[PDB]
Amino acid sequence: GPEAVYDLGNLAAFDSNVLDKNDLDSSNARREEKIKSLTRDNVQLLINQLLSLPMKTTMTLLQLPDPTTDLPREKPLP
Amino acid sequence: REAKLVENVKQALFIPGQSCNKNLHDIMVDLSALKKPDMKRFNRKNDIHPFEDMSPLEFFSEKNDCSLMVLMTSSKKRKNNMTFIRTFGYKIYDMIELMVADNFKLLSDFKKLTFTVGLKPMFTFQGAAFDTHPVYKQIKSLFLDFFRGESTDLQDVAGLQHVISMTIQGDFQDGEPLPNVLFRVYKLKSYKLPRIELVEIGPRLDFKIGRIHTPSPDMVTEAHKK
């Protein structure tokens, strides 16, 4: 049961827990309940992370950290 | 649009291919809607074969200023095939075929709920291979890049509306077939921190992984340069 990893600047949560193909098989009648349930648990954790960030009020704003996932630019650096 | 130190939001161009059918067009319309307002689409078909001639994609990317493209084709061999393409300096960066399984669901298959357009999405990725397998790492990079929208330092709590969820269809050992990737979109609800509940809004897509094109090491260095 590894801990979830967060990239809060991208509002993203990463879950490396074991997944069982029998729970998610296209013929499994409860596959969507299982997918939604997993997503719901990870969204709860993500929201809890986001809501513990420093906040401003101008309406309430979170101060997101810089995104950490390495994503390619669309154009070369000037 | 000239290069910038802080880049614009990536724009996506959806391209019906010659063999695009009605089902595929409906999928395209609903998935492209999620990328609004940073989205363009062609109304007519184009005869594109990405793995035999990438040239028309590079021209489209430059002409329409879209560094993200999705081509829609279908054959008996590759049914409901969505080829996702990213460019760097308008040249092909990577491509991957993601073929939509027959169990897909459209927006119309879910009870209509209000949906504010243009909000930044949350993401949850379920599956260890998204961090360690070269194919699933590309898929995670692609979908974050594709849908994350505007980068911001201030996030409005009230705009935390929906989540894009991507799940690998079970763990797998090397040598086994690569499992499908399960794409889901949910809107948040809550009740009293509150307990979050989710309601699916669609589209619901199961992607079967096809062929890939990856960048040379030189291009990687260029594209990821700080």
Author numbering:
A (entry chain B): 16 to 73, 87 to 106
B (entry chain A): 19 to 210, 218 to 251
Question: From the publication, what sentences describe this entry?
Answer:
The 5' region of pre-rRNA that consists of the 5' external transcribed spacer (5' ETS), 18S rRNA and the internal transcribed spacer 1 (ITS1) is co-transcriptionally packed into a terminal ball of ~40 nm in size. These particles represent the earliest assembly intermediates of 40S and are known as the 90S pre-ribosome or the SSU processome. Within 90S, the pre-rRNA is cleaved at sites A0 and A1 in the 5' ETS and site A2 in the ITS1, yielding a 20S pre-rRNA intermediate. The fully assembled 90S contains an unprocessed pre-18S rRNA, U3 snoRNA, approximately 51 assembly factors and 18 r-proteins with a molecular mass of 5.0 megadaltons.
The EM densities were docked with the available crystal structures of yeast 40S ribosome and AFs or homology models of AFs.
